[PDB]
Write a protein that binds this ligand. Sequence first.
Ligand SMILES: [Ca+2]
Lengths: 56, 221
Amino acid sequence: DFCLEPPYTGPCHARIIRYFYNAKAGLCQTFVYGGCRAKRNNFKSAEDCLRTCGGA
Amino acid sequence: IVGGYTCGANTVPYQVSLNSGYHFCGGSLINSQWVVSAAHCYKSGIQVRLGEDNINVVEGNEQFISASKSIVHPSYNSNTLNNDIMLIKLKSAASLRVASISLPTSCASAGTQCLISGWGNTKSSGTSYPDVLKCLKAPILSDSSCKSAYPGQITSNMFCAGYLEGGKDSCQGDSGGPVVCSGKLQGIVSWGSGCAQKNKPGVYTKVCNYVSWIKQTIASN
Ligand SMILES: [Ca+2]
């Protein structure tokens, strides 16, 4: 389950705000994504995050 | 920028901030209507902010101009990060505190000292994004050492710059920004393994390899 994976910033140096499902909190939170090599628990909006991972 | 210093208001006049509701990448003004940045900084709805020092407060010297076109290198590979370069056309020409930087006539050699700038994280690890632009002087490293630090990941279009001891480096939020050596734009902040880690210098897009593509692309768009 990729929804239970911790957020991955990656090697690139941008500061792009994305969302990831935080299983502990039971909600989608924001994190800094570097711009490349994103894993699946990385969404552009909280809605996308909740639709895909909500309740995992 | 980890381990750097405050540049000073408008002392790096070619430095721009790419804004999408917040600063997410840097870039360099290479023409009154064109900016060069990294391909991984590609985003829709980009607003380019010129003449910035404190990115959090309006100080009067700014020019906010929307991008009309964003051209990512046709051979950019998101997996290998090869050809990590992008051109952004401004919706209107910037009024030249705001100045363009020259493209290189030739590639720089290992040992060359360069100025790297940006509004990225200043902590190795931790988080601390600055208000004002930070600067860092770092030397270009040999292809041999760059390849030793990142086995099988360095292409002919990339170069390392920084210190093997760690402590001084680019970091999240600096991507797309300039590496000027020098008075010529030699690199674009691209990637690395963490920030300011020992034996893990930052990797930059080698601009001298794209000068013809840049000139022709700017001219036919
Ligand atoms: Ca400002």
